[PDB]
Amino acid sequence: KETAAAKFERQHMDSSTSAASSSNYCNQMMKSRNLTKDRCKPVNTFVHESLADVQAVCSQKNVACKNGQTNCYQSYSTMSITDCRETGSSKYPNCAYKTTQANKHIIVACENQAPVHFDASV
């Protein structure tokens, strides 16, 4: 089944809008991208930029990952992102999320020139 590159797109890419339109953005996308199937993923970020622009981040500023790995990369420019984070009332299989809009640099782990993990924002 899924390649790590394709898992990145599915979990993290919404190029269909420049910002989260409303507060129920996360409830709808966390479900429709299969991040609540087996359990509610606690936190997840959506990037509102071209696939081309996010892929390019792999050849921008080389940085350390939270775990101390050295294959992480930070965008030269801030990007439009939505942070998704489970509410206190959330319980599998009824997973509920807080939506938060932000313009921040994305830090991604790359493999064979492609984004394969979303690590942090600054």
User: What SS3 state is found at 61?
Assistant: strand
Sequence-ordered list of residues with C-beta below 8 angstroms from that of 58, at least 6 positions apart, any chain: 73, 108, 110, 113, 114, 115
Reported residue count of the chain is 122
Which residues contribute to the annotated binding site for substrate? 7, 10, 41-45, 66, 85
- Write the DSSP assignment of 75-116 as a string of letters: -SS-EEEEEEEE-TT-BTTB--EEEEEEEE-EEEEEETTEEE
Which residues contribute to the annotated binding site? 7, 10, 41-45, 66, 85
Q: Are 82 and 121 in contact (CB under 8 A)?
A: no
Q: Where are the domains of the chain?
A: 1-122
Residue 29 phi, psi dihedral angles, 5° rounding: -85, -40
Q: Are 23 and 99 in contact (CB under 8 A)?
A: yes
Q: How was this structure determined?
A: X-ray
Tell me the longest C-alpha to C-alpha distance in the chain. 40
User: Cis ω on the peptide bond leading into residue 93 (within 30° of 0)?
Assistant: yes
Catalytic amino acids?
12, 117
CATH topology of domain 1-122: P-30 Protein (3.10.130)
Q: Residue 1: exposed, middle, or buried by beta-carbon count in 10 A (0-12, 13-18, 19+)?
A: exposed
**In the block, residue with structure tokens 């807080």:** 98
